[PDB]
Design a protein around this ligand. Structure first.
Ligand code: CLA
Ligand code: CLA
Ligand code: CLA
Ligand code: CLA
Ligand code: CLA
Ligand code: CLA
Ligand code: CLA
Ligand code: CLA
Ligand SMILES: CC1=C(/C=C/C(C)=C/C=C/C(C)=C/C=C/C=C(C)/C=C/C=C(C)/C=C/C2=C(C)CCCC2(C)C)C(C)(C)CCC1
Ligand SMILES: CC1=C(/C=C/C(C)=C/C=C/C(C)=C/C=C/C=C(C)/C=C/C=C(C)/C=C/C2=C(C)CCCC2(C)C)C(C)(C)CCC1
Ligand SMILES: CC1=C(C/C=C(\C)CCC[C@H](C)CCC[C@H](C)CCCC(C)C)C(=O)c2ccccc2C1=O
Lengths: 74, 95, 141, 80, 742, 147, 42, 33
């Protein structure tokens, strides 16, 4: 059970990393902004700073507080 | 003129300027006895053909390796001996 | 302008280093720089060490263009002399390389043409989807 | 070898050429700027790719622009 | 001639330059356009060769900076002596220096940290220190907190004195270049006066203070009813009863009848059995003889009169069999480059620090130092790290000399030119011997791991297997065990007992340096040490030699000593600078010194440190497992890292909880460094520009524009946190283990 | 298309350095960036590559089945499953010492063996597949599917 | 004192003063109210 | 001879096939049409 859970979770993390890497490769190689003007996909790049900054808020909050509580308990 | 005083760019003698010198290549004649040389020239000629040497070395090394491993008794290497001991039970009975 | 026709001029006084022409000269192109030094003086050559260039014409054979042009910029900025280097293939055909018009490339000499030049801002390049499945890239239209 | 394409936002400051350690670039006459000159790139086959040309380009982003491409012995900075 | 050569009031003392920050340069004395301005302010803060391009102002700056450093060291010494005075169990340690942990730090009871005040012993709750300061104070015959308090006030006085001296020698009356450039006088004074009279006066202290008080303490005396040192000076009957050689006076000295002075200046080799340190009679004779030696050595160079030597006159007249025509121009580069001198001095000072570690573990000079295993481990570990760091700084400053302060036109040297010419042969053969050493040491370890894992211990490299015995070091041990009988008959016992013999100087239930054996594992790990040292030398010497030019970048001296790269061209030039080479040599110095201190701690805990029984058999800490487990990396992982790091995880609760905590946090910061070394500035600048968008959307945009760290600064932060976390992990591990077992 | 080993890319084939080898290994499956590429040929290479991957998947499963059928104690495992160790495959390592042969002999095997921590024993036993001939048949069928 | 108040106004000097005061505040609070895990004052 | 088959194939795949593949792919690496 441990080998299987570890296997499929590391495989899943890698597959997820690849999903995102291929989304990046799509945005570079295959994305045509003039074909998809103002649609639901170009609106990602319209406000990408908000997404990136609020992910940078959530991760920063989680790390600050998770590590603070873990270190408090240490 | 490459042999002038501090001239090292003779354009027609571009082997001396590029450094195409044989640092240690001696053109001195055959030092071995010619009969020993003839013996080695006749007895090693079968290995001269490269395309027939690569194939020969592959199908001879693999043959000797898969043979000497097969007929290796349980005194050279212990993997072909076996356990030679009662197998012990694992944790939790055996699991 | 006509090139300067590299002669068999002398070389600097150098005791030899491990920074010379190993095999990129035997089978590939190597380079050669010529500079007229008004006086004999010491200079840090780009292959490591320190050579003494002679008065009048000097000639130094180097392994790549960056050595030649680094030495040339140090000469033109520190000793204020006029350098010009070549490229000599192992069969001959010495190629005149550095100025290419007599005047240094920072000066806008007429005659030299516009090659590698896009008449657009840098962000008006089309996307890779436009040039996909084509031998051209997004910076060659 | 490499592909050093330049763009018309160049102002003719002659710093990309004064930084180039391989003489890839050279100023030509032009009529698109106050300085009346622009930086061509004939000797792209001599380009190592060091991007000193675009670490000295005083534009909003860049005018000279090095696109790394097929690497030859001249572009791999090889003295051997 | 060597004049005084100073000038009055070169720089006006004022807080105007305190106000404007980054005043000291052109590109920093404008204000922050970005946040890189702050980092470049601190980075170029002490780069005096960048601020002002003349050796006069540079030399004044470094002179007064050395005064500030001396003020800091005196302030730190005042702190240690004072914490030993008012916040210590020094009296209780003097009464029983075998069961009372040296403690000179007490914490404040605020958030539960009061449990760090441990039962060290002596009616005192505090932190067991490991600086060995108590051992120094017993070697000085202190025996009172009043004396520690007054020397703390004296060290504060000297800190104020050095601070005033720096202020005076920069702002009020500063020397000029004719004062620093003369070095015959500097050497003559630093030899005869600093090191000569320094050792002379320390020998005077020892002859007049340390020897009598330590003989009293060894005989058994409560430190309260012990006579003071000035009573030994004044009351001649007292010191004469201690040593009757004093009864005759200095007519033994001035009539050269020194044979009767052999009651207190003995050559008694070996360790003091009563206390485990060296013989303080031997140490007093040592410092006296060293004083005579350096005093006659400091009269070698010509300063102002006719007699002496010129260092120029020596170096320019030193012909020999191998490139002796050179050595001309070295007086020029060393008297016109502070970076050359800094490199050379850092190399030799760090090597001396390593020599210091190696000679303090083995010839413990202070009483009750060898049996405070925390003191021995901490001292060896410390001075090893300091030596490695100082050698890596020697690299950095050799490189900075090679880039900036190197002109073949004016300041030419034949030897340095000959080294730069064949530098590729140097680095090629050093790369080869590094590969050879990596193989025939670490691959021996891997062979041992494979064979022990394949169930073939007969095929390992061990004493019970294929033996790789250190015949040469074993022969040296055999000689030095027999040296004092034939070669050095003045010594009754060997210089050390690590060689051999029936000598085991236990002071209590503790060993203190029995003879260290040398087996196959010691061969293996000594070749690992030669390996790591050679790779560090490879990286550092390579950065030094290729600081200027190479086959890749022939104009690197125009790019600087400390630049990231010359772009992705030529395949890539990412860490081509000499700064990047010292940055990598730091990692390799870390690997080297870490395996050195691992060898030290395990070898001593397995073969030396332990308890001694009433039957006469020694029980070591780990139990002699170095010859069988330290041949495999699994044994270092199991019998050393996993086994000895049990006290640092059971540390929680008892005083050592901080060492437990500083374990994990150190484990963190090391890993925190990996955020910097692995990554690059571009990703972080783009993340920062997204966050800057998030800040512009709330009118909280800063004016100091947020920029990701410089590439070189990312590498610096990375190697900094890496060394800090790894070294603090090892420090927590070492101190918790050795304070919880010995 | 090109001359040297990266036949799919004449930019790495015209690279004198060792970077040719590495980058021709790495960029081998990046069909979108190859020379003389079309969307048609890209899609067809992707389809054939998917077929190759399915073939390798069925071959790897056939190998699992064969090495549990040949070298596994699966017929003994289906009797007392929760007290008999699975066996992934045998081991013939000529570097093994005799203690390592004594140690790696598990599960009631004729020699040294590896313990199947993958769960193929439990899964195969749950879906039927009782005797070793069933696993042999499955390995034959998955070789057929690979072909 | 002129230009000393500008130095003490600088970010690190001001940060160490602010955080020394703040840390002393927290330290003395934890002396006064040690071992706190709830806010029971409402 | 079925306990002898590992002795046949483990060298033939692990020593012989790697030599074959390394030689063939080194020739393919250095070929020039
Ligand atoms: C269904 C699964 C799947 C498929 C079909 C592909 C297919 C592809 N990927 Mg993706 N990828 C995947 C999963 C997948 N990947 C996962 C799980 C990850 C996360 C680890 C990635 C991360 C990833 C990156 C980061 C990149 C690709 C790229 C590519 C393309 C070229 C492959 C190449 O040059 O390397 C072939 C690989 C080898 C020959 C072996 C390399 C050695 C590895 C480390 C171990 C084996 C190709 C379109 C590249 C691309 O688009 O080109 C620019 C690219 O940059 N992929
Ligand atoms: C232990 C190692 C470690 C730690 C702590 C972090 C921490 C972080 N990484 Mg990761 N990272 C690491 C290793 C690590 N990384 C490695 C090895 C890599 C591979 C290169 C990366 C690659 C990486 C990327 C690519 C990204 C991150 C991001 C982040 C941030 C995530 C948000 C978060 O949790 O912030 C909460 C804060 C922390 C966890 C910081 C811990 C320190 C404490 C809380 C601060 C106070 C300490 C103390 C009082 C200061 C005094 C000391 C001194 C002044 C004397 C955070 C700074 C992301 C990011 O920055 O965006 C937000 C991001 O995009 N990291
Ligand atoms: C209070 C008296 C005083 C005053 C007003 C000045 C004023 C001045 N000095 Mg002088 N100086 C003094 C004392 C003084 N100095 C002393 C005592 C020394 C001996 C160390 C020097 C040595 C000295 C040198 C060598 C130089 C100056 C320079 C200067 C000018 C620039 C000051 C500046 O920006 O740095 C302000 C900097 C600070 C306030 C930092 C203080 C650093 C101290 C010494 C060390 C503290 C380290 C600390 C213990 C460790 C860090 C711990 C931390 C991590 C918690 C200015 C005219 C410079 C100059 O004019 O040249 C252009 C110059 O090069 N001073
Ligand atoms: C025999 C006299 C003598 C002595 C004892 C020293 C001692 C020292 N010098 Mg040297 N020096 C001398 C002569 C002397 N010097 C001469 C003649 C010159 C000119 C050529 C120099 C030029 C010189 C430079 C350029 C530098 C030193 C430095 C140092 C210090 C190195 C740090 C150290 O080892 O700390 C050991 C610490 C101590 C022994 C504590 C010192 C306490 C006493 C009070 C000072 C030593 C006496 C001193 C010469 C002052 C005399 C009285 C004064 C009022 C005039 C050390 C204190 C370096 C340094 O640290 O900068 C400050 C440094 O940069 N000196
Ligand atoms: C006698 C000792 C000595 C002396 C006088 C110098 C002097 C100098 N060094 Mg050298 N150096 C030394 C030892 C020494 N170094 C050692 C031992 C090393 C090896 C690590 C180096 C490595 C080194 C490099 C690699 C570089 C220098 C540079 C410099 C110059 C500028 C330094 C500066 O402004 O930073 C001012 C001070 C700082 C920025 C502070 C540094 C902070 C340290 C690294 C953090 C560690 C502190 C602590 C242990 C960690 C806990 C802290 C806590 C608060 C959490 C200056 C000439 C630089 C130079 O000349 O380049 C042009 C340069 O690039 N040095
Ligand atoms: C464990 C991690 C690790 C390992 C193994 C290496 C290995 C090496 N480093 Mg690196 N390095 C590392 C981490 C590591 N490094 C890190 C983290 C840094 C951070 C800065 C560096 C920085 C660095 C620099 C800056 C330098 C090195 C150098 C070296 C080499 C010196 C030793 C050598 O060649 O001897 C022989 C090889 C070894 C000891 C490596 C282990 C191999 C073992 C012995 C067994 C081999 C088995 C055999 C070949 C069978 C293979 C299997 C078969 C199927 C083919 C070697 C390639 C130096 C170098 O390349 O020049 C000499 C150098 O200058 N390293
Ligand atoms: C982020 C994670 C995190 C969290 C949530 C906590 C939470 C806590 N920690 Mg832990 N801790 C952490 C990280 C964390 N810590 C880390 C990283 C460390 C290692 C550095 C520690 C180390 C540590 C120790 C060693 C101790 C704690 C303690 C505490 C408690 C604090 C009690 C206290 O003094 O506050 C009291 C409240 C204040 C100080 C705030 C006062 C603010 C001022 C006065 C203004 C408020 C009034 C204002 C004007 C408004 C009034 C309203 C109106 C009238 C205007 C609390 C449960 C202590 C404790 O009791 O243990 C449980 C304790 O001993 N922590
Ligand atoms: C991808 C699937 C796969 C994998 C990973 C393995 C793995 C292994 N096989 Mg098996 N094998 C497989 C499929 C597989 N096999 C198939 C499909 C067949 C039927 C043709 C065999 C028939 C087979 C025999 C007869 C032997 C192995 C052996 C081995 C071992 C050494 C390699 C050699 O084999 C040679 C590889 C092949 C014949 C496969 C060609 C396709 C190794 C554990 C040897 C062993 O038992 O070592 C303990 C051994 O003697 N394999
Ligand atoms: C509770 C529950 C429920 C519900 C749930 C839900 C509703 C969930 C959801 C979930 C979700 C919602 C999830 C998600 C996931 C996601 C992911 C995982 C993503 C990813 C992404 C990516 C990877 C990307 C890529 C890309 C890019 C980058 C760009 C371009 C495009 C693309 C897309 C390609 C119910 C009742 C029913 C049941 C029970 C439980
Ligand atoms: C610990 C410490 C301290 C203190 C210390 C001390 C206290 C010291 C002292 C010192 C001293 C107290 C010294 C002295 C010296 C002396 C000398 C060095 C001498 C010499 C002599 C001589 C050389 C002689 C000669 C002669 C003779 C022989 C006889 C007659 C004649 C004549 C004179 C010529 C302090 C606080 C700082 C702090 C820190 C630490
Ligand atoms: C994490 C990281 C960063 C981001 C690191 C940041 C930008 C530096 C850390 C700056 C601190 C957090 C700034 C805040 C300190 C200020 C003085 C503000 C004090 C006020 C309160 C916060 C107390 C890089 O820029 C980088 C660059 C090159 C290689 C690797 C990396 C890298 O790993």
């Amino acid at each position: 059970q441990a080998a299987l859970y570890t296997h499929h979770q590391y495989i899943a993390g890698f597959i997820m990393t690849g999903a995102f890497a291929h989304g990046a490769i799509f945005f570079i190689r295959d994305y045509n902004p003039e074909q998809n003007e103002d649609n639901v996909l170009a609106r990602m790049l319209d406000h990408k700073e908000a997404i990136i900054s609020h992910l940078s808020w959530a991760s920063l909050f989680l790390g600050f507080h998770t590590l603070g509580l873990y270190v408090h308990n240490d | 003129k490459y042999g002038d005083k501090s001239v090292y760019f003779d354009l027609e003698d571009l082997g001396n300027t590029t450094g195409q010198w044989d640092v240690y290549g001696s053109d001195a004649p055959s030092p071995y006895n010619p009969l020993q040389s003839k013996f080695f020239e006749t007895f090693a000629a079968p290995f001269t053909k490269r395309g027939l040497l690569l194939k020969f070395l592959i199908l001879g090394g693999g043959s000797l390796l898969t043979y000497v491993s097969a007929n290796s008794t349980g005194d050279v290497l212990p993997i072909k001996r076996g356990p030679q001991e009662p197998p012990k039970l694992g944790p939790r009975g055996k699991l | 302008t006509p090139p300067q026709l590299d002669p068999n001029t002398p070389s600097p006084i150098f005791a030899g280093s491990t920074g010379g022409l190993l095999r990129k000269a035997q089978v590939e192109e190597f380079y050669v720089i010529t500079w007229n030094s008004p006086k004999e003086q010491i200079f840090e050559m780009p292959t490591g060490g320190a050579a003494i260039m002679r008065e009048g014409p000097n000639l130094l054979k180097l392994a790549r263009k960056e050595q030649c042009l680094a030495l040339g910029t140090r000469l033109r900025s520190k000793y204020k002399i006029t350098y010009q280097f070549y490229r000599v293939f192992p069969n001959g055909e010495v190629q005149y390389l550095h100025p290419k018009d007599g005047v240094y490339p920072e000066k806008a000499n007429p005659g030299r043409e516009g090659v590698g030049l896009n008449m657009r801002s840098i962000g008006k390049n089309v996307s890779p989807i436009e040039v996909k499945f084509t031998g051209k890239q997004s910076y060659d239209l | 070898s490499h592909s050093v394409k330049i763009y018309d936002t160049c102002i003719g400051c002659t710093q990309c050429v004064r930084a180039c350690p391989t003489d890839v670039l050279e100023m030509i006459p032009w009529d698109g700027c106050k300085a009346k000159q622009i930086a061509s790139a004939p000797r792209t086959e001599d380009c190592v790719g060091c991007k000193r040309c675009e670490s000295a380009c005083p534009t909003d982003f860049l005018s000279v622009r090095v696109y790394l491409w097929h690497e030859t012995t001249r572009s791999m900075g090889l003295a051997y | 001639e060597v004049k005084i050569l100073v000038d009055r009031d070169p720089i006006k003392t004022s807080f105007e330059e305190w106000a404007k920050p980054g005043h000291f340069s052109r590109t920093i004395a404008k204000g922050p356009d970005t946040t890189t301005w702050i980092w470049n302010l601190h980075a170029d803060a002490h780069d005096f060769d960048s601020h002002t391009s003349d050796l006069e102002e540079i030399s004044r700056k470094v002179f007064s900076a050395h005064f500030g450093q001396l003020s800091i060291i005196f302030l730190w010494l005042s702190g240690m002596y004072f914490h030993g005075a008012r916040f210590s169990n020094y009296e209780a340690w003097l009464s029983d220096p075998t069961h009372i942990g040296p403690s000179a730090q007490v914490v404040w009871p605020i958030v539960g940290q009061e449990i760090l005040n441990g039962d060290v012993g002596g009616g005192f709750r505090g932190i067991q220190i490991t600086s060995g300061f108590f051992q120094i104070w017993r070697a000085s015959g202190i025996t009172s907190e009043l004396q520690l308090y007054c020397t703390a006030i004296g060290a504060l006085v000297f800190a104020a004195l050095m601070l005033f001296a720096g202020w005076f020698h920069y702002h009020k009356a500063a020397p000029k270049l004719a004062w620093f450039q003369d070095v015959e006088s500097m050497l003559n004074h630093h030899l005869a006066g600093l090191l000569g009279l320094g050792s002379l006066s320390w020998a005077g202290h020892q002859v007049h203070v340390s020897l009598p008080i330590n003989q009293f303490l060894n005989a058994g005396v409560d430190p309260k009813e012990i006579p003071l040192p000035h009573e030994f000076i004044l009351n001649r009957d007292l010191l004469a009863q201690l040593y009757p050689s004093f009864a005759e006076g200095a007519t033994p000295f001035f009539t050269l009848n020194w044979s009767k002075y052999s009651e207190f200046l003995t050559f008694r080799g070996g360790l003091d059995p009563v206390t485990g340190g060296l013989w303080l009679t031997d140490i007093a004779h040592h410092h006296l003889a060293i004083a005579i030696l350096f005093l006659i050595a400091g009269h070698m160079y010509r300063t102002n009169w006719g007699i002496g030597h010129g260092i120029k006159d020596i170096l320019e007249a030193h012909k020999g069999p191998f490139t002796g025509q050179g050595h001309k121009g070295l007086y020029e580069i060393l008297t016109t480059s502070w970076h050359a001198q800094l490199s050379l001095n850092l190399a030799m000072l760090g090597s001396l620090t390593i020599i210091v570690a190696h000679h303090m573990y083995s010839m413990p000079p202070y009483p009750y130092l060898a049996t405070d295993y925390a003191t021995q481990l901490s001292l060896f570990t410390h001075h090893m790290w300091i030596g490695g760091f100082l050698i890596v700084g020697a690299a950095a400053h050799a490189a900075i000399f090679m880039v900036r302060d190197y002109d073949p036109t004016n300041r030419y040297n034949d030897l340095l030119d000959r080294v730069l010419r064949h530098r590729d042969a140097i680095i090629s053969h050093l790369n080869w011997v590094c590969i050879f050493l990596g193989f025939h040491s670490f691959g021996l370890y891997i062979h041992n791991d494979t064979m022990s894992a394949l169930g073939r211990p007969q095929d390992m490299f061990s004493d019970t297997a294929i033996q790789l015995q250190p015949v040469f070091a074993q022969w040296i041990q055999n000689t030095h065990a027999l040296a004092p009988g034939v070669t050095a008959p003045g010594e009754t016992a060997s210089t050390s007992l690590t060689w051999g013999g029936g000598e085991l100087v236990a002071v209590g239930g503790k060993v203190a340096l029995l003879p260290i054996p040398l087996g196959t594992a010691d061969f293996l790990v000594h070749h690992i040490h030669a390996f790591t040292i050679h790779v560090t030398v490879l990286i550092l010497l390579k950065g030094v030699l290729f600081a200027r030019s190479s086959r890749l970048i022939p104009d690197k001296a125009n790019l600087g000593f400390r630049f990231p790269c010359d772009g992705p061209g030529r395949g890539g030039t990412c860490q081509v600078s000499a700064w990047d080479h010292v940055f990598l040599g730091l990692f390799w110095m870390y690997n080297a010194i870490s395996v050195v201190i691992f060898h030290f701690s395990w070898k001593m805990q397995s073969d030396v440190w332990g308890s001694i029984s009433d039957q006469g058999v020694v029980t070591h800490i780990t139990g002699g497992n170095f010859a069988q487990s330290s041949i495999t990396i699994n044994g270092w992982l199991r019998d050393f890292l996993w086994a000895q790091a049990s006290q640092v995880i059971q540390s929680y609760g008892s005083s050592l909880s901080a060492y437990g905590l500083f374990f994990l946090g150190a484990h963190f910061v090391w890993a925190f460094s990996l955020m910097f070394l692995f990554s690059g500035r571009g990703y972080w600048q783009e993340l920062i520009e997204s966050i800057v968008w998030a800040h512009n959307k709330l009118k909280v945009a800063p004016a100091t524009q947020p920029r990701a760290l410089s590439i070189i600064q990312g590498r610096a932060v990375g190697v900094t946190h890496y060394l800090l976390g790894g070294i603090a992990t090892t420090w927590a591990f070492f101190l918790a283990r050795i304070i919880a077992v010995g | 298309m090109a001359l040297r080993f990266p036949r799919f890319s004449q930019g790495l084939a015209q690279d004198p350095t060792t970077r040719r080898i590495w980058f021709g290994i790495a960029t081998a499956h990046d069909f979108e960036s190859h020379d003389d590429i079309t969307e048609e040929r890209l899609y067809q290479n992707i389809f054939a590559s998917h077929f190759g991957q399915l073939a390798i998947i069925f071959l790897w499963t056939s190998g699992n089945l064969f090495h549990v059928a040949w070298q596994g104690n699966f017929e003994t495992w289906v009797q007392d499953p929760l007290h008999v160790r699975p066996i992934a495959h045998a081991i013939w390592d000529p570097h093994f010492g005799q203690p390592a042969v004594e140690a790696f002999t598990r599960g009631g095997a004729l020699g040294p063996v590896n313990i199947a921590y993958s769960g193929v024993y439990q899964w195969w036993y749950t879906i039927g597949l009782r005797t070793n001939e069933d696993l042999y048949t499955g390995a034959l069928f998955l070789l057929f599917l690979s072909a | 004192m002129r230009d000393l108040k500008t130095y003490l106004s600088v970010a690190p000097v001001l940060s160490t003063l602010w955080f020394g005061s703040l840390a002393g505040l927290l330290i003395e609070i934890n002396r006064l109210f040690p071992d706190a895990l709830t806010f029971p004052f409402f | 001879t079925f306990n002898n088959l590992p002795s046949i194939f483990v060298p033939l795949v692990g020593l012989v096939f790697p030599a074959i593949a390394m030689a063939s792919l080194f020739l393919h690496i250095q070929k020039n049409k």
